[PDB]
Amino acid sequence: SEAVKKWVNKIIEENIIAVFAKTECPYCIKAISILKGYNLNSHMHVENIEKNPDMANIQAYLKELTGKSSVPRIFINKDVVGGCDDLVKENDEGKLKERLQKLGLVN
């Protein structure tokens, strides 16, 4: 499906911070909360792909893009961050803040 791929692409390209998530997902909630803690709300889009008829297609495409089909899947300025664990590593090690500084998202 070109359609599914184009829809996912639009989400990643039109939002600096793009998070693909599912319903009642602790790690999705944690990742989104960490990102909102940097006051990134205005440039964040969260897509619940479980509430979607094409969940499997979306997950397969996210795996083609990132190596994993699991949610959360996190992109920042179209770059692959990965899952919540990747986000936690970047956050603890200063990489996330550097990412956001280069985007003028954090002082």
Domain positions in the chain are 2-103
Q: Is 98 annotated as a binding residue?
A: no
CA distances from 87 to 2, 9, 79 (A): 29, 21, 12
Q: What is the CA radius of gyration of the chain?
A: 13
To the question of whether residue 39 is assigned a binding role by annotation, the answer is yes
47 is in an annotated binding site: yes
Between helix 84-92 and helix 26-37 the angle, nearest 10°, is: 30
The answer to whether the annotation marks 90 as part of a ligand binding site is: no
Question: What is the separation of C-alpha 92 from the centre of its chain, rounded to a whole number of angstroms?
Answer: 18
CA 21 to CA 18: how far, in whole Å? 10
- The count of residues in the chain is 107
The superfamily (CATH) of domain 2-103 is Glutaredoxin (3.40.30.10)
Q: How many angstroms from the chain centroid is the CA of residue 69?
A: 12
**Is residue 80 classed as helix, strand or coil in its secondary structure?**
strand
Report the structure determination method.
X-ray
Question: Could you write out the three-class secondary structure of 45-70?
Answer: EEEECCCCCCHHHHHHHHHHHHCCCC
